[PDB]
Amino acid sequence: ATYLIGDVHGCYDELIALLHKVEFTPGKDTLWLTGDLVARGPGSLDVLRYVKSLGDSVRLVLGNHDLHLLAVFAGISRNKPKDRLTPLLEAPDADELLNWLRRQPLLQIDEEKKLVMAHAGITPQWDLQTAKECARDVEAVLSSDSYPFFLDAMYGDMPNNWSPELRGLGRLRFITNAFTRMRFCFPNGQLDMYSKESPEEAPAPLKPWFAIPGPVAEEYSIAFGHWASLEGKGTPEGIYALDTGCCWGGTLTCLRWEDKQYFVQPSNR
Numbered sequence: 001a002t003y004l005i006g007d008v009h010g011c012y013d014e015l016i017a018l019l020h021k022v023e024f025t026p027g028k029d030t031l032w033l034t035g036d037l038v039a040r041g042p043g044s045l046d047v048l049r050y051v052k053s054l055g056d057s058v059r060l061v062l063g064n065h066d067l068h069l070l071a072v073f074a075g076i077s078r079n080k081p082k083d084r085l086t087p088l089l090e091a092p093d094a095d096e097l098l099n100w101l102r103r104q105p106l107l108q109i110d111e112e113k114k115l116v117m118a119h120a121g122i123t124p125q126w127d128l129q130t131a132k133e134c135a136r137d138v139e140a141v142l143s144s145d146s147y148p149f150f151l152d153a154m155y156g157d158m159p160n161n162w163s164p165e166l167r168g169l170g171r172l173r174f175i176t177n178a179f180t181r182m183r184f185c186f187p188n189g190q191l192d193m194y195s196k197e198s199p200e201e202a203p204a205p206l207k208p209w210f211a212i213p214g215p216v217a218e219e220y221s222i223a224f225g226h227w228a229s230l231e232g233k234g235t236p237e238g239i240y241a242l243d244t245g246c247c248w249g250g251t252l253t254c255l256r257w258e259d260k261q262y263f264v265q266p267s268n269r
């Protein structure tokens, strides 16, 4: 079976309980994870250890908090106490875990299921070939020996409009924001980097990225996490918002792809 779970945010106990609920069995089943494995919840260390151990039985995409952890580890960014990353950063296997983490994709595609996953979704300004090329470029920088230079370069809110003519720092910044921070779009598809509330309580003319017709969403189902204030609600057919805010006292959601059956684990907090 194929299971897809939204942002775990260090909620190891809930993750394992949800996987036991569905009798998740590596070798017979595959797990897709929307990223943001770490931060806020208490068990980022255990989460990364487990997910790395799954190997080919897990398909991960990196989220914005995974990238932030990598930046903290590399000495690029400051550790925020509320993220609760210190046990992971101080672990004897921190190098192994984080060097594995930075090698993981930004984008997962399964052609037989016509299914795409990224942390925040797929901007309507991208077709599939462009999304793939952009994921490859940023994955290449993250898996290289020079990844701390990219992590430093990644921070920024501009440019927020895609063009194939974008080059250099702006190109990588837009790519990173589209895959890991996107929520609202302007009517022309341009990213808004500030509003993080639910679609109903957002100011006009902002609309969810998935409310703007785009070439990937026309052909593929898209699963994503990231947007906790969405509460997994209000998406169009073929769009699966899996982040139901476990670390926030919400729930951890798992979708089984074959029958579109949902399973939910209450937050322990």
Ligand SMILES: Nc1ccn([C@@H]2O[C@H](COP(=O)(O)OP(=O)(O)O)[C@@H](O)[C@H]2O)c(=O)n1
Pocket: 036, 064, 065, 196, 197, 226, 227, 228, 229, 230, 245, 248
């Ligand atoms: N149900 C919720 C959950 C979070 N939030 C807020 O949304 C902001 C972004 O958090 P998020 O969980 O959606 O995304 P990430 O920061 O994990 O990437 C936080 O500052 C939360 O306070 C909200 O307004 N409503």
Ligand SMILES: [Mn+2]
Pocket: 007, 009, 036, 063, 065, 226, 227, 228, 243
């Ligand atoms: Mn998140």
Ligand SMILES: [Mn+2]
Pocket: 036, 063, 064, 065, 119, 180, 225, 226, 227
């Ligand atoms: Mn996120």
